[PDB]
A paper describes a structure:
In the light dependent stage two large, multi-subunit, pigment-protein complexes known as Photosystem I and II (PSI and PSII), are embedded in the thylakoid membranes, absorb light and turn physical energy into energy stored in chemical bonds. PSII mediates light-dependent water oxidation, which supplies electrons and protons to the photosynthetic process and releases oxygen, while PSI mediates NADP+ photo-reduction. In cyanobacteria, PSI is found in a trimeric or monomeric form, though recently has been reported to appear also in a tetrameric form. Under optimal growth conditions, the trimeric form of Synechocystis PSI is more abundant, whereas the monomeric form is present as a smaller fraction of the total complex.
To investigate the Synechocystis PSI monomer we performed a single histidine addition to the C-terminus of PsaL to generate a PsaLHIS mutant strain. The mutated strain generated mostly monomers (monomer-to-trimer ratio is 4.5:1), which allowed us to examine the monomer structure more easily, now constituting the major fraction of PSI, while taking specific interest in the trimerisation site. The crystals generated from PSI of PsaLHIS were solved to 4 Å resolution and showed some differences in PSI structure, in comparison to WT PSI, primarily in the region of PsaL, and PsaI. The C-terminus region of the PsaL in the native trimeric PSI (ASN144-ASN157) creates a short helix which can interact with the neighbor monomer’s PsaL and assist in trimerisation stabilization, however, the addition of a terminal histidine has disrupted the short helical structure and created a loose C-terminus in PsaL. The largest dislocation and structural differences in the PSI subunits was observed in PsaM, PsaI and PsaL which are all located at the trimerisation area. Despite a shift of 2–3 Å in PsaI location toward PsaM and away from PsaL, both carotenoids that were coordinated by this subunit remained in their position and orientation. However, a dislocation of about 1 Å in PsaM from its original position caused carotenoid M4021 to interact exclusively with PsaM whereas in the native form it is coordinated by both PsaM and PsaI. Moreover, the WT PsaL contains three chlorophyll a molecules and two β-carotenes, whereas the PsaLHIS monomer contains only one chlorophyll a molecule and no β-carotene molecules. Whichever the case may be, the results suggest that these ligands, that are possibly incorporated during trimerisation, might play a structural role and not just participate in excitation energy transfer dissipation. Despite the change to PSI super complex’s oligomeric state in the new PsaLHIS strain, the kinetic tests we preformed showed no significant effect on the activity of PSI.
Author numbering:
A (entry chain B): 367 to 439
B (entry chain F): 1 to 143
C (entry chain D): 1 to 141
D (entry chain E): 2 to 70
E (entry chain C): 2 to 81
F (entry chain A): 2 to 751
G (entry chain B): 513 to 585
H (entry chain J): 1 to 40
């Protein structure tokens, strides 16, 4: 029971780190002329849609999962 | 084949048949407990005595998920479509925000009563090009 | 500058004034002339009575002096626009601060140099990938 | 080549209305970097915390715009 | 000390100087706007960074920018 | 509007004939009271700022004569609201309760005054309280009040509700009248001497006078029969006592003499119903009503006499201006000079006193009702006792922080430095740092020497070292002063109170009164576990006072911000500069003090709830022994944090989680629901709006993609509003959790 | 298991949403189009423009840490 | 007069009237036909 939870918390810090360093890549190392029109810059070109659909799916989850739990209670 | 072998119908389930004789009454009708005993006895049950619902898409349980899914989606599309059309209708009247704060009841009701055909209206706005917008015409943030 | 002439305001002393570091490191003084004897609020706390004519008061930092200056001209009908703020050193060195060139920094004035002026837009700043490993920022270049 | 009442789309990137379309109010004479004053139907962010709205007008340049109408 | 810059989008309305509480900002005659003036920051040594200037800017996004830096006794707003 | 004659007789009455006309066009215009909001909503924040400033009349108009006329009608409307609510309770007692079914056998049935509509399974919430009635067992203690007032039939409660609705209509009408027909001038208001005379002699004096008359003619002669064993249907009506004054003359020997002895200074003869027995009633477990009538008569005489100290129109009397200008010593210079003018002009200055005193008095009400139970059978109803106590704790706790809010409001909005030149307020503003730093030191001291004791006890009991603990069986911390005053109050009837027969309360020491099978009140032995928790309470209150005091002594300015008075009362900050100027306003200080008031009362109510269940409440044996609920472990287990975590929380929370399937299931539901709202508040309290506005940007792009964006541009909550929603949900979730837990626990102890 | 798996899916989608909006909008936005000039971690931008608390790409990491901990709980 | 007809048609009054109406609909439907975990 201890080893599993240990490794899961380890990985839960590792993923947040993977994202925190990508933000730092965008802040310090992203070159918009070097990566022009590539698959990386198109991610920035449609970032509103990515964030919007992430919010939609998180709402679509949270709403019904919480509603079903409260309904069962 | 023998799909859901670990699940037995409520008509055969042990714990469910034990608990169904002792069902509480929700409304004022004293038969409501026995009404549930007779009503839920058709669904599949588990070894604990509680009904289970299968939503994998099979038509045997289309009453479990398919009917509420369709009924919701209908009513929700109705809501969203009349809201969107009324929001567009406001954009040509005096003060586009005041009429969003103070509701034009003779207009909101007129748009609500014409929402039972929202799929046809939406397809007619998509073919003509009114449903969606163009990316080159929407305010976006610096990349 | 040469001399800091002025009468200390009528005040029964407070704990919000200057301290030991404020006397040893640096303190600030403000000189102004009052048309009459009236009551004004202390930027450190309480209400004091300014003397008629030239006044003098020492404060801890500069923002306190400027907060009193912005109060003097706005609350009283005989507005005080001649308040002069000086920075005092531990060696008696007193220099002029506010107003700078005799005129308030609000309205424009002839004889000032463009400091921090850029010839671009904020959306025209260079990319941080072009200046990394150099001791310069996208706004410093 | 603009007049009072023209629909133009902002192309100032960092602008709050970059991509939105506003109405030209008045254009000032030569000798100004941003003489084209444009009004908008939507306020920006400007204002202290808790303000009711913002500013719906700004000055731009001709190379930063695109007529629509 | 903090860094204060003023961009060519400034219309010279003196609002950022009317809001500055430490006499950090001034106004110099310019040739870009109708008012023919632009904001100036000669006394950056007295800038605490309370952003009272940026709050009082009218142009589409700021024309004056404040970038916080190496904090000192004067920038920290220390009165003791 | 209408036009009455004049209604005056050589008075200071001064009104304006129809200042504000009556119309409905301003109803369809939201936010019209504010100039900044009348131009129409341009962002969604415009909506929030509409409610955030709905009652702030200073930002609306600057004329004080208009603000006072608004406040008067606002009070009238509040009184209408209150009368509506009270008629609700009387009507639910008349037609949706079992007050008659409870009055018969009060020791074998539970109070209930609500019936749940049987639908979608919620009909299970109707618990069998006894006697065939099914409903929610109430804890507000309305049946005890209605028994102590003489209510015996449902028609009485019905007529009470009707009268309450009539009074609600009257207050609602008077509000409109005093703002749309004849609104009073300033000449009618600023008579604080006259207003104090009228509020003492007429309101608080004649009120207790008339209520004592009621008790002597209604409450006492009917409760005397109720406590004897007479059926309510055989007990006569209150007006049959005045229609036949002989029936009253006989039921009390003093009444058998007439009215003349009272006028001829023969008070001692009325000792047959104006008694001074004290203690409690062995039949009901509450205070003696014969003592309460005498008490209300005494309070009435005292208040009517007090209403004749200040000067009005006939020359005699005092002027508070004179009294304030007279008090001045060598320590404070001019003393109270200018304070009359402070409290006769600034409404916030008055509210910062009234709220403080009203909250303190509500706390006193709780602390006095719990130990000297004044209502019949309320000391046996542990649920009702706990509920009244904690509810009157929370009301006062909120009303106290209101004072620290409105004081800072007065400082920023109404403090004129020219009007305060070397008096109490001005000189207090000088040495702000002295008081604040000294209170800082005191709070640190009380934190180390009250909570560190609990930490040390937990570490000692964890290390297996019993002889090193602060307990009643080791390094004892006995409270000598409290035990001494307990013993003083015990020996009162035979020394410093010869006329008193019993002690004020049996909590100090004495006999153990018990009704039916449960105990009413017994001596509360105070030991180490009481000393430590009392010091915990003192520490938490000290920190709350420090916060709410620095909120007022620095709302004007500080070494950090010297121009803070310009920024107003409610503002988030003054930029990230100066290292960080976040949360410096008085509004932010009240936002912080709310949490500490909650944290202090959280330990206060837990101290009450565990000490009562452990060293007071419990079943009494027919031989005489008393066995407490938690077996008296408070003096031996409440000394460690693990004791409160296990034997208090974990042990007594079992009633709430195991409540599913019963009539108490709603309490478990609300327990989890408060656990939900608590955590929901943390999202606001830990984040900042700069992220939420950037997210709203993406959602706005998504809406404009389908061309569904509202013209009201969506804007995240302001920083202040973010903090406000955070603290509101924090308090709501916590108080709902504790309410559900306390009610489910108190209802499950028999 | 189904309901707890959907709660887990919510915990993943929302944490990733926060960590992705922090990385994408790390160079700029419509509140701060010059976020790239302020670096990765910075306090804010001031109370103006409605408010700028927790606006840096570092603050998004700080917020998503709570969601990672909740998902791992 | 129209001043009150505009107040009865404001956002909060209407958004509470619709919620009350929908509550009535749902409550009466689950009164006459309760316990509908799925469709028969
Ligand atoms: C129990 C506490 C709690 C709750 C309920 C939430 C809930 C939410 N967080 Mg959140 N969060 C929390 C704590 C919490 N957080 C904490 C402590 C932090 C660290 C500061 C964060 C940091 C955080 C970030 C950074 C983000 C979120 C986001 C979200 C939203 C994701 C959408 C969703 O889940 O779908 C559905 C929504 C729900 C399940 C919650 C709604 C529940 C109500 C009861 C539904 C019914 C409405 C109700 C009837 C209204 C009427 C009220 C009336 C009585 C007055 C969601 C509403 C993300 C977001 O904004 O989404 C895009 C986002 O990026 N959170
Ligand atoms: C006409 C009203 C309307 C319409 C057509 C839409 C449509 C949409 N919204 Mg949206 N929204 C609305 C109102 C509306 N919203 C309101 C009032 C709010 C504030 C609570 C939001 C907040 C919101 C968020 C946070 C998000 C969306 C998103 C979306 C998109 C995905 C759908 C979704 O998320 O599921 C359902 C939408 C919701 C659960 C949000 C609440 C919907 C409200 C309560 C219904 C409005 C009813 C309206 C008053 C009807 C007016 C009738 C008229 C005659 C008076 C979609 C195109 C998502 C997105 O960005 O796209 C991917 C998303 O993240 N909305
Ligand atoms: C039908 C009678 C009537 C009418 C037509 C008006 C009309 C008006 N009143 Mg008025 N008023 C009335 C009764 C009435 N009042 C009563 C009975 C009171 C005593 C409480 C007041 C006290 C009062 C004050 C102090 C003020 C007004 C003001 C106004 C003007 C603006 C009102 C506004 O802002 O929009 C409408 C506002 C609402 C619809 C508020 C909604 C109701 C709130 C949320 C709670 C209701 C509490 C209620 C009074 C008591 C509860 C009843 C009980 C059964 C629970 C307006 C012309 C204001 C003014 O003159 O402008 C400067 C002003 O300051 N009124
Ligand atoms: C003996 C005469 C008398 C009586 C019985 C009252 C009684 C009352 N006054 Mg009052 N008052 C009086 C004389 C009197 N006043 C005079 C002469 C003046 C002028 C100096 C005032 C000026 C005054 C003001 C300004 C206010 C009151 C208020 C009140 C009410 C507050 C108590 C409450 O709400 O509890 C419960 C109420 C019923 C059980 C109360 C019913 C307050 C109020 O409610 O506003 C209407 C209020 O703000 N009075
Ligand atoms: C009789 C007592 C009293 C009175 C007359 C006032 C009067 C006033 N207060 Mg005040 N206050 C009081 C007590 C009082 N307060 C107390 C006890 C506290 C401590 C909590 C405060 C703390 C406080 C603060 C922090 C502020 C005020 C402010 C104000 C002014 C504006 C009111 C406003 O914002 O509009 C209307 C009020 C609201 C819209 C609040 C609505 C939100 C409530 C709290 C939600 C509560 C939920 C509900 C009760 C229970 C949950 C159920 C839910 C599921 C539906 C006003 C003159 C504001 C001001 O600027 O002063 C000039 C200000 O910011 N007060
Ligand atoms: C378990 C969490 C925790 C702990 C251990 C503390 C501990 C402390 N807080 Mg604190 N506080 C907390 C949570 C906590 N707080 C939270 C969540 C809030 C937000 C409402 C606050 C808000 C707060 C304020 C506003 C203040 C404190 C102060 C203090 C210090 C008082 C000195 C003392 O107690 O004497 C001995 C030390 C330990 C027993 C103390 C070290 C006060 C202070 O600085 O001291 C004067 C102070 O003003 N706290
Ligand atoms: C958001 C998810 C969700 C979903 C999908 C459902 C779905 C359902 N709920 Mg439910 N409910 C929910 C949330 C949800 N609930 C929450 C959060 C609560 C707490 C307030 C409740 C409390 C609740 C109660 C008290 C009851 C239901 C009932 C029902 C069933 C009745 C359907 C019906 O009325 O026929 C069709 C309707 C119109 C055609 C249905 C399958 C009823 C039932 O008996 O379940 C079988 C019922 O009594 N729910
Ligand atoms: C629980 C208590 C048992 C422990 C013993 C503690 C001893 C307390 C010290 C004696 C009282 C000091 C106040 C009177 C002394 C007093 O008020 O003298 C009077 C003096 C001013 O009086 P004046 O001569 O100006 O009188 C004119 C007035 O009418 C106003 O002009 O006030 C002050 O001294 C200001 C300094 C206050 C700062 C000292 C207060 C200390 C704070 C803590 C107080 C603890 C009280 C606890 C009570 C529950
Ligand atoms: C097979 C089926 C399910 C499987 C479902 C599949 C996997 C889901 C597929 C989803 C796909 C990927 C997305 C579908 C459509 C996506 C497009 C973009 C929809 C766009 C809708 C927009 C344009 C509508 C906009 C406007 C519509 C017209 C009406 C609204 O009022 C208002 C408003 C929102 C403004 C499972 C889960 C397996 C269970 C099984 O029993 C049944
Ligand atoms: C079915 C199955 C299979 C297959 C599988 C697969 C193949 C899948 C998958 C999957 C996957 C594979 C998933 C995933 C995940 C991922 C992740 C988790 C990621 C990440 C990363 C990140 C998030 C980062 C980003 C960034 C940023 C932020 C910006 C800058 C740049 C960078 C890049 C740094 C097999 C047959 C073999 C076996 C059986 C089962
Ligand atoms: C989520 C969040 C937001 C966004 C919050 C928003 C947009 C509030 C959402 C309100 C919605 C639109 C209304 C729903 C709530 C209603 C008040 C409930 C009324 C329901 C009745 C109609 C029945 C902030 O603005 C913020 C600011 C500062 C610190 C933290 C935060 C923060 O955490
Ligand atoms: S407010 Fe901004 S744009 Fe206007 S003069 Fe000052 S720095 Fe220039
Ligand atoms: S950041 Fe603040 S202190 Fe610095 S120049 Fe701007 S307004 Fe003045
Ligand atoms: Cl323990």
């Amino acid at each position: 029971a201890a080893l599993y939870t240990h490794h899961q918390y380890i990985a839960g810090f590792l993923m947040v780190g993977a994202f925190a360093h990508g933000a730092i890549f965008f802040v310090r190392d992203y070159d918009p002329v070097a990566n022009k029109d590539n698959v990386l810059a198109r991610m920035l070109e449609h970032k509103e849609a990515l964030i919007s659909h992430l919010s939609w799916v998180s709402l679509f989850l949270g709403f019904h999962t919480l509603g079903l739990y409260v309904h069962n209670d | 084949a023998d799909d859901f072998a670990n699940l037995t119908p409520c008509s055969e389930n042990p714990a469910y048949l034990a608990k169904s004789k002792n069902f509480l009454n929700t409304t004022n009708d004293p038969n409501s407990g026995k009404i549930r005993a007779e009503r839920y006895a058709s669904a599949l049950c588990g070894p604990e005595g509680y009904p289970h619902l299968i939503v994998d898409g099979r038509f045997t349980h289309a009453g479990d998920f398919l009917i509420p899914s369709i009924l919701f989606l209908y009513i929700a599309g109705w809501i969203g479509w009349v809201g969107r059309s009324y929001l567009i209708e406001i954009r040509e009247s005096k003060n586009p925000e005041m009429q969003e704060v103070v509701i034009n009841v003779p207009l909101a009701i007129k748009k609500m009563l014409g929402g039972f055909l929202w799929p046809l209206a939406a397809v007619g706005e998509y073919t003509s090009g009114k449903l969606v917008m163009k990316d080159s015409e929407i305010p976006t943030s610096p990349r | 500058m040469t001399e800091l002439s002025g009468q200390p305001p009528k005040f029964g002393g407070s704990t919000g004034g200057l301290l030991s570091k404020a006397n040893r490191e640096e303190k600030y003084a403000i000189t102004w002339t009052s048309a009459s004897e009236q009551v004004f609020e202390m930027p450190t706390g309480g209400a004091a009575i300014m003397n008629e004519g030239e006044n003098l008061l020492y404060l801890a930092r500069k923002e306190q002096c400027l907060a009193l200056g912005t109060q003097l001209r706005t609350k009283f009908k005989p507005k005080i626009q001649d308040y002069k703020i000086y920075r005092v050193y531990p060696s008696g060195e007193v220099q002029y601060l506010h107003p700078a060139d005799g005129v308030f920094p609000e309205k424009v004035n002839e004889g000032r140099e463009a400091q921090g002026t850029k010839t671009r837009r904020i959306g025209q700043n260079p990319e941080p990938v072009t200046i990394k490993f150099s001791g310069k920022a996208p706004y410093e270049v | 080549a603009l007049n009072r009442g023209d629909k133009v789309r902002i192309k100032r990137t960092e602008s709050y209305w970059y991509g939105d379309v506003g109405t030209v109010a008045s254009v000032e004479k030569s000798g100004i970097l941003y003489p084209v004053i444009v009004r908008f139907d939507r306020v920006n962010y400007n204002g202290f915390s808790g303000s009711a709205s913002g500013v719906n007008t700004n000055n731009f340049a001709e190379n930063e715009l695109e007529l629509v109408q | 000390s903090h860094s204060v810059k003023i961009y060519d989008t400034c219309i010279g309305c003196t609002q950022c100087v009317r809001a500055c509480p430490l006499d950090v900002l001034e106004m110099v005659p310019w040739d870009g706007c109708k008012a023919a003036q632009i904001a100036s920051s000669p006394r950056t040594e007295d800038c605490v960074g309370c952003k009272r200037c940026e709050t009082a800017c009218p142009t589409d996004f700021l024309s004056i920018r404040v970038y916080l830096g190496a904090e000192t006794t004067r920038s920290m707003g220390l009165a003791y | 509007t209408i036009s009455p004659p004049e209604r005056e007789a050589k008075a200071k009455v001064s009104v304006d004939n129809n200042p504000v006309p009556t119309s409905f066009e301003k109803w369809g215009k939201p936010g019209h009271f504010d100039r900044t909001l009348a131009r129409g909503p341009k962002t969604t924040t415009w909506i929030w700022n509409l409610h955030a400033n709905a009652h702030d009349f200073d930002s609306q108009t600057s004329d004080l004569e208009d603000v006072s006329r608004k406040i008067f009608s606002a009070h009238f409307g509040h009184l209408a609201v209150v009368f509506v609510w009270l008629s609700g309770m009387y009507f639910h007692g008349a037609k949706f309760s079992n007050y008659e079914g409870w009055l018969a056998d009060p020791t074998h049935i539970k109070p209930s005054a609500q019936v749940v509509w049987p639908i979608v399974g919620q009909g299970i919430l109707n618990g069998d309280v006894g006697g065939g009635f099914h409903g929610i067992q109430i804890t507000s203690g309305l049946f005890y009040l209605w028994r102590a007032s003489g209510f015996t039939d449902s028609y009485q409660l019905y007529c009470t509700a009707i009268g309450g609705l009539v009074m609600a209509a009257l207050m609602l009408f008077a509000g409109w009248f005093h703002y749309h027909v004849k609104a009073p001038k300033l000449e009618w208001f600023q008579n604080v001497e006259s207003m104090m005379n009228h509020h003492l002699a007429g309101l608080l004096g004649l009120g207790s006078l008339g209520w004592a008359g009621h008790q002597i003619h209604v409450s006492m002669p009917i409760n005397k029969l109720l406590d004897a064993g007479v059926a309510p249907k055989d007990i006569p009506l209150p007006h049959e006592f005045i229609l036949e004054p002989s029936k009253m003359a006989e039921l009390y020997p003093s009444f058998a003499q007439g009215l003349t002895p009272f006028f001829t200074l023969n008070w001692g003869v009325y000792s047959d119903f104006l008694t001074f027995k004290g203690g409690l009633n062995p039949v009901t477990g509450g205070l003696w009503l014969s003592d309460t009538a005498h008490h209300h008569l005494a309070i009435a005489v005292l208040f009517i006499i007090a209403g004749h100290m200040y000067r009005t129109n006939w020359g005699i009397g005092h002027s508070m201006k004179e009294i304030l200008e007279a008090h001045k010593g060598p320590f404070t210079g001019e003393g109270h000079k200018g304070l009359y003018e402070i409290l006769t002009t600034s409404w916030h200055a008055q509210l910062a006193i009234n709220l403080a005193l009203l909250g303190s008095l509500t706390i006193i009400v709780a602390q006095h009702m719990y130990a000297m139970p004044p209502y019949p059978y309320q000391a046996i109803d542990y649920a009702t006792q706990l509920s009244l106590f904690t509810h009157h704790m929370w009301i006062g706790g909120f009303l106290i922080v209101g004072a620290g809010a409105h004081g800072a409001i007065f400082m920023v909005r109404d403090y004129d430095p020219a009007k305060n030149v070397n008096n109490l307020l001005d000189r207090m503003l000088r040495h702000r740092d002295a008081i604040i730093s000294h209170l800082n030191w005191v709070c640190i001291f009380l934190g180390f020497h009250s909570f560190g004791l609990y930490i040390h006890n937990d570490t000692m009991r964890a290390l297996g070292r019993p002889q090193d603990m602060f307990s009643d069986t080791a390094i004892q911390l006995q409270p000598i002063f409290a035990q001494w005053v307990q013993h003083l109050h015990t020996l009162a009837p035979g020394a410093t109170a010869p006329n008193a027969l019993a002690t004020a309360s049996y909590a100090f020491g004495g006999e153990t009164i018990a009704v039916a099978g449960k105990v009413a009140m017994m001596p509360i032995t105070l030991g180490t576990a009481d000393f430590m928790v009392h010091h915990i309470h003192a520490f938490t209150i000290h920190v709350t006072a420090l916060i709410l005091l620095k909120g007022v002594l620095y709302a004007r300015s500080s070494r950090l911000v010297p121009d803070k008075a310009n920024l107003g009362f409610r503002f988030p900050c003054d930029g990230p500069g100066r290292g960080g100027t976040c949360q410096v306003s008085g509004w932010d200080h009240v936002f912080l003090g709310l949490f500490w008031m909650y944290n202090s009362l959280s330990i206060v109510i837990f101290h009450f709830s565990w000490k009562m269940q452990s060293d007071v409440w419990g079943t009494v044996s027919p031989d005489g022994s008393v066995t407490h609920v938690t077996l008296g472990n408070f003096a031996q287990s409440a000394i460690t944090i693990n004791g409160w975590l296990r034997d208090f929380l974990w042990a007594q929370a079992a009633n709430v989680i195991n409540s599913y399937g019963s009539a108490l299931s709603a309490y478990g539901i609300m327990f989890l629901a408060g656990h939900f709202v608590f955590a929901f508040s943390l999202m606001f309290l830990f984040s900042g709006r700069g992220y939420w506005q950037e997210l709203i940007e993406s959602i706005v792009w998504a809406h404009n993609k389908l061309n569904v964006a509202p013209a009201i541009q969506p804007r995240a909550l302001s920083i202040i509003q973010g903090r406000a929603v955070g603290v509101a949900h924090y308090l709501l979730g916590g108080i709902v959790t504790t309410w559900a837990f306390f009610l489910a626990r108190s209802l499950s102890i028999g | 298991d189904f309901l707890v798996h959907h709660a887990i899916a919510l915990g993943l989608h929302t944490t990733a949403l926060i960590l992705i909006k922090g990385a994408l909008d790390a160079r700029g936005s419509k509140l701060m189009p010059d976020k790239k000039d302020f670096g990765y971690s910075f306090p804010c931008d001031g109370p103006g423009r409605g408010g700028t608390c927790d606006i840096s790409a570092w603050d998004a990491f700080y917020l998503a840490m709570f969601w990672m901990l909740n998902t791992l709980g | 007069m129209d001043g009150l007809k505009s107040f009865l048609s404001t956002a909060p009054v209407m958004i509470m009237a619709l919620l009350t109406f929908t509550a009535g609909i749902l409550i009466e439907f689950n009164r006459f036909y309760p316990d509908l975990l799925f469709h028969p």
